[PDB]
Amino acid sequence: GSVSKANVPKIDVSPLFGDDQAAKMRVAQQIDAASRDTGFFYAVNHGINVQRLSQKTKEFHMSITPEEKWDLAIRAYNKEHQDQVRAGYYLSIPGKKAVESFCYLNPNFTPDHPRIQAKTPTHEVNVWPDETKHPGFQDFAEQYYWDVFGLSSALLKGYALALGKEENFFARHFKPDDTLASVVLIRYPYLDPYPEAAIKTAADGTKLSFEWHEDVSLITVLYQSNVQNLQVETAAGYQDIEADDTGYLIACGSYMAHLTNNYYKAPIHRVKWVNAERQSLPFFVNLGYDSVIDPFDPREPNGKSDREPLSYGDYLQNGLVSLINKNGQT
Ligand SMILES: CC(C)[C@@H](NC(=O)[C@H](CS)NC(=O)CCC[C@H](N)C(=O)O)C(=O)O
Ligand SMILES: [Fe+3]
């Protein structure tokens, strides 16, 4: 009853920022190979200062007070905030729930933005702590949104080429003026004693902090500190994903699986319980509310797929609710 380790290749993605088309195809091949195996790879040579990301996130997590958390809380924790379904603070519950997080959306979502004016679901105006109590936090967080947006746009070029498409096949739908992408700054704390109520037990006996799921995204671009915790499901059981706090862990979400007829699966994964202070900082690569990509099937000579096109806004709204229903309010 031992646990094997997943093959998670490290892919130099730097050619995807350049104009060497053959080098980009060689990256795309590596993305294809990983996407057809266990679905995860580490993007290296990504150009983002992840040390600064981790340090600024830690300063925020470790200095925000319970008062500030109520003031930023999403609707699930504060009935006064009916407009915050996505963006805001996700409180821990001492003795019951260890995890806590802060989620923010496209900074271009302002009261002027037409989707906010129209009150379209999944669109919200970000909430932020007091600048003098958290100096430079909002500036860092907004800058990081566009830093990882740029990396994500390059990765989407790699995925498009990997599937035999022109490099903008996905990226053309990934735009700063309407992207529903989100950043979540998750704190997993060290706790002694650790609350038993915050630990789940999987069917195979493994103690978990978060149960199996597929990501609600096109792709997910994830930075985690150096504490091993993630597992990917394979036909022969769950395998450990090695940690690497210098790179980004990349995987497809269920929207990619939908449009490729599962040719690129959304890998099922879960979070092992580990009693260690650590960070989990995902960027969910979401398209626009009206974005639609025609499904295709790489396995078939003509690429035909009879799967219906799915509007991304419908997918996102339904998917986020379903993930809460199935795996709990985070
Ligand atoms: C690394 C992940 C597995 C992380 N969990 C997560 O990020 C989980 C599963 S992918 N994701 C979510 O709950 C979706 C949050 C969506 C966000 N509020 C939004 O409005 O866009 C963890 O560490 O728990
Ligand atoms: Fe996930």
Domain CATH code at residue 92:
2.60.120.330
Question: Do strands 41-44 and 237-240 pair parallel, antiparallel, or not at all (unpaired)?
Answer: unpaired
Distance between CA 64 and CA 141 in Å, rounded? 15
Is the peptide bond between 94 and the residue preceding it cis, with omega within 30 degrees of 0?
no
Sign for the CA dihedral angle at 40, 42, 48, 51 comes to positive
The structure tokens listed for 247 are: 């790179």
Q: Is 112 annotated as contributing to ligand binding? A: no
Give the structural domain span for 189: 10-327
Enumerate residues 6+ apart whose C-beta is below 8 A from 28: 158, 159, 161, 162
Q: Is 61 one of the annotated active-site residues of the chain?
A: no
Angstrom resolution of this structure = 1.6
Q: What angle is formed at CA 24 by the lines to CA 165 and CA 222, rounded to 5 degrees? A: 90
3 occurs within a structural domain: no
256 occurs within a structural domain: yes
The amino acid that residue 162 corresponds to is A
Q: What is the domain count for the chain?
A: 1
**b/e map 110-141, b = 16+ CB within 10 Å:** eeebebbeeeeebbbbbbbbeeeebeebbebb
- Residue 43 sits at φ, ψ, to 5 deg, of -85, 120
Task: Return the H-helix or E-strand segment holding 30.
Answer: helix 21-36
Ranges of beta strands (E only) in 159-215 are 182-188, 200-201, 207-213
319 occurs within a structural domain: yes
Distance between CA 5 and CA 20 in Å, rounded? 34
How deeply is 106 buried, as exposed, middle or buried, from its count of CB atoms within 10 A (0-12, 13-18, 19+)?
buried
Enumerate residues 6+ apart whose C-beta is below 8 A from 286: 179, 180, 181, 182, 217, 218, 312, 316
- Residue 182 sits at φ, ψ, to 5 deg, of -135, 155
127 occurs within a structural domain: yes
The structure tokens listed for 94 are: 């001492």
Atom of ligand 1 nearest to the CA of 101: 18
The structure tokens listed for 326 are: 């199935």
* Ligand 2 geometric centre to CA of 217 (Å): 9
Sign for the CA dihedral angle at 272, 249, 258, 298 comes to negative
5 occurs within a structural domain: no
- Residue 41 sits at φ, ψ, to 5 deg, of -150, 160
Helix (H, G, I), strand (E, B) or coil at 248: strand
Ranges of beta strands (E only) in the chain are 10-12, 41-44, 88-90, 100-104, 182-188, 200-201, 207-213, 219-224, 230-234, 237-240, 248-252, 269-272, 278-285
185 with 101: CB under 8 angstroms?
yes
* Nearest to 181, CA basis, from 211, 212, 222, 209: 222
CA 326 to each of CA 75, 202, 239, 267, 321: distance values in angstroms, whole numbers, following the listed order? 18, 14, 22, 17, 9
- Residue 259 sits at φ, ψ, to 5 deg, of -75, -15
For atom 11 of ligand 1, which residue has the closest CA? 215
2 occurs within a structural domain: no
Distance between CA 286 and CA 219 in Å, rounded? 8
Name residue, tokens 């821990």: 92
For atom 17 of ligand 1, which residue has the closest CA? 86
Atom of ligand 1 nearest to the CA of 85: 20
Q: Is 152 annotated as contributing to ligand binding? A: no
Distance between CA 109 and CA 113 in Å, rounded? 6
Atom of ligand 1 nearest to the CA of 86: 20
Q: What angle is formed at CA 254 by the lines to CA 250 and CA 260, rounded to 5 degrees? A: 95
| Residue of 184, 248, 269, 272 to mutate, ligand 1, most atoms within 8 A of C-beta | 184
Angle between helices 137-162 and 50-63 (to 10 degrees): 140
Distance between CA 30 and CA 213 in Å, rounded? 24
For atom 14 of ligand 1, which residue has the closest CA? 320
Ligand 1 binding pocket, CB closer than 6 Å = 86, 103, 182, 184, 186, 210, 213, 215, 222, 271, 280, 282, 284, 320, 323, 330
Distance between CA 303 and CA 114 in Å, rounded? 37
Distance between CA 308 and CA 240 in Å, rounded? 35
Report the chain's C-alpha Rg in angstroms: 19
290 with 313: CB under 8 angstroms?
yes
* Ligand 2 geometric centre to CA of 214 (Å): 6
Residues in the chain: 330
295 occurs within a structural domain: yes
The one catalytic residue among 83, 213, 244, 314: 213
Distance between CA 258 and CA 168 in Å, rounded? 18
Q: Hey, which residues does 98 pair with through a beta bridge? A: none
Distance between CA 132 and CA 152 in Å, rounded? 31
Q: Is 215 one of the annotated active-site residues of the chain?
A: yes
Within 10 Å of residue 275's Cβ, how many Cβ atoms?
16
Name residue, tokens 């805001």: 88
Half-sphere exposure of 328 (CA within 13 A, CB side): 16
1 occurs within a structural domain: no
283 with 222: CB under 8 angstroms?
yes
| Residue of 61, 215, 326 to mutate, ligand 1, most atoms within 8 A of C-beta | 215
Distance between CA 322 and CA 32 in Å, rounded? 29
